[PDB]
Design a protein around this ligand. Sequence first.
Ligand SMILES: Cc1cc2nc3c(=O)[nH]c(=O)nc-3n(C[C@H](O)[C@H](O)[C@H](O)COP(=O)(O)OP(=O)(O)OC[C@H]3O[C@@H](n4cnc5c(N)ncnc54)[C@H](O)[C@@H]3O)c2cc1C
Length: 257
Amino acid sequence: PDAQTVTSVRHWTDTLFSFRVTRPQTLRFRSGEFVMIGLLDDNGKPIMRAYSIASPAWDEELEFYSIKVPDGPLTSRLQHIKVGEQIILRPKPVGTLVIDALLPGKRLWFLATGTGIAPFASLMREPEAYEKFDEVIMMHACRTVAELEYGRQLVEALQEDPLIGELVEGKLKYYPTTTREEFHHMGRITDNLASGKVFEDLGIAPMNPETDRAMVCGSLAFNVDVMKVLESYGLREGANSEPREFVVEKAFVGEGI
Ligand SMILES: Cc1cc2nc3c(=O)[nH]c(=O)nc-3n(C[C@H](O)[C@H](O)[C@H](O)COP(=O)(O)OP(=O)(O)OC[C@H]3O[C@@H](n4cnc5c(N)ncnc54)[C@H](O)[C@@H]3O)c2cc1C
């Protein structure tokens, strides 16, 4: 049912892997949206979970960036998937992490923790982000250095490619941090935005409600705290119906692994 086939798999850590699958021929989506994917349980019943599509809308395959939860009904199984095996994929994209859900502006911030970088793996590879904005800032905070690797490699490939670098024109600013392991840049996104450390580190103007638009993707706790910081700079939450300066989505439901 709604089956698509795994074309590649990549393991990053013992809790993180990415994979790619074939795309339904009629699937249309906007970068930043999520769909339901799944596998069958031991009784032949679907185990369905929401996943951001980690590949941009132009990409001919669909990429996903996944947690591995030991004893997690879906990921305890999904972590073992192989090329040629299949997943269930519902081709019904939705979500508020989309450029259309924000007022037009000059700078676009992506604020993510852990697998919350997933919708921004798509958006950082979306032409629209660079056509409609002069600067795209990717803040990704994880506990450890290895958890940043998937995103670091994505950003490196983008910036180092001769053509893409030309088209992007220095617009992408990447600000990875750790909160536990030693790394040259540390700290929570909330703390580093509120204190202005990120402005100094990247050599950019402070957050400005006139020109800045942001998207937030992490745990509920992260989202709540980030919203407060954004609002302290004068940015207001909206979405599609009445777009304002920022949008938020949960990277997962619960407390997190
Ligand atoms: C809008 C939406 C988009 C999502 N996008 C992604 C995504 O792109 N990639 C992804 O891996 N998951 C994503 N999730 C979570 C995903 O739906 C599942 O929870 C995940 O596949 C784990 O499923 P499970 O059955 O193995 O464990 P579950 O029973 O769902 O969860 C077990 C525990 O692990 C924690 N957990 C679940 N997912 C994560 C996560 N990704 N990071 C840290 N802790 C987690 C939860 O707090 C829960 O305690 C998303 C969830 C939503 C609501």
